[PDB]
């Protein structure tokens, strides 16, 4: 099954990626890195989230609407895997890519809150420095930034942790084991998918959003009330 999939992988690779990665994935001098040994997971992350192709050299690549569908993504990943392998996709017990089954070490049918606690402390330890407390993203040096984690599915999160896309450090499966990674996924999805008890969240950016809101519009409405109650002379 994979042997014929690799052919479509090659056909798609020849028509898009050579200009940056070479016919033999060796890379190009300043135009793109070598893809030997990156594996299925890096290709899946890069193509499925739509980061590749990169049509402009920049401080950082951008997520966008993907140029290929799922089957084409797996075909290109199979072709790249044939050149040296690498980290692999997390296949579930039936053979499909794992989605919604990575939400915690002890997932049954709903997010276990103990996993959420451990994953919250893990995310605060490692991930929250570049992203923020709830994964709303953050800034870096010279025009680079850490994206907001609301866009990615669970497989993309796992392969992001595994591969270290551009400036993200790698988190191998022996630094952060599968239980730790799945608890991190559980915490990310819990924070994403739970409404704030205290009303509208103001984006959860912290003091900046709350400040801007009050110190512009909250005081503006009260001076409007004062003008209603007072006089202009």
């Amino acid at each position: 099954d994979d042997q014929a999939l690799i052919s479509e992988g090659k056909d798609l690779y020849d028509v898009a990626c050579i200009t940056c990665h070479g016919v033999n994935l060796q890379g190009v001098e300043d135009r793109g890195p070598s893809l030997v040994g990156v594996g299925e997971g890096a290709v899946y992350f890069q193509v499925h989230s739509g980061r590749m192709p990169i049509l402009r050299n920049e401080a950082q690549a951008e997520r966008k609407a993907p140029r290929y569908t799922e089957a084409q993504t797996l075909a290109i990943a199979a072709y790249v895997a044939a050149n040296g392998g690498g980290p692999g996709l997390v296949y579930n017990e039936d053979g499909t890519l794992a989605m919604e089954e990575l939400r915690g070490e002890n997932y049954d049918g709903q997010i276990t809150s103990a996993d959420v606690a451990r994953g919250g402390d893990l995310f605060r330890l490692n991930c929250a420095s570049c992203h923020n407390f709830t994964g709303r993203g953050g800034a870096l040096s010279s025009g680079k930034y850490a994206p907001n984690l609301d866009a990615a599915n669970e497989q993309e999160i796992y392969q992001a942790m595994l591969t270290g896309p551009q400036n993200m450090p790698k988190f191998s499966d022996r630094q952060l084991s599968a239980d730790e990674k799945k608890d991190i996924i559980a915490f990310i999805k819990s924070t994403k998918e739970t409404p704030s008890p205290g009303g509208y969240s103001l984006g959860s950016l912290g003091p900046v959003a709350e400040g801007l809101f009050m110190w512009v519009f909250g005081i503006l409405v009260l001076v409007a009330a004062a003008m209603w109650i007072g006089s202009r002379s």
């Binding site: 519009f217 006089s231 202009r232 002379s233």
Partner: protein
Amino acid sequence: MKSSAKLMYGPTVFMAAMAVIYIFATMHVSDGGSVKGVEWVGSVALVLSAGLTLMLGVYLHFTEVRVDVLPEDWEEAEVADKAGTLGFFSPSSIWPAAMSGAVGFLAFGVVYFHYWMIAVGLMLLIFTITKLNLQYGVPKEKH
């Protein structure tokens, strides 16, 4: 407003004739170096361009059959004919600049697509437009 009401009939009829000619042409001529078949972009534009000019012309004519022999159109009018009030004109107003800034804020909001910027931009925009339209009718200070 007689001459300008009626001179608009040339452009509109020319555009309408070009629209029908073009629709028949692209739907029939199977020339090499091109593909047969009616194209809707362009034809729709031509018919509604004829529509714009026809709307202008017909409204102006429909109005002009009402008005009198204005001295600006009378070929031997004297300067004393138009003596009187010409009309009301705004002396000054800060609100055009304000609502330009409001539209700018809204446009920047849709650039980055921060939803709060879009909402605040629309609110600020209707506020500035309202302040523009009520400028010469705000009530006197109520004691």
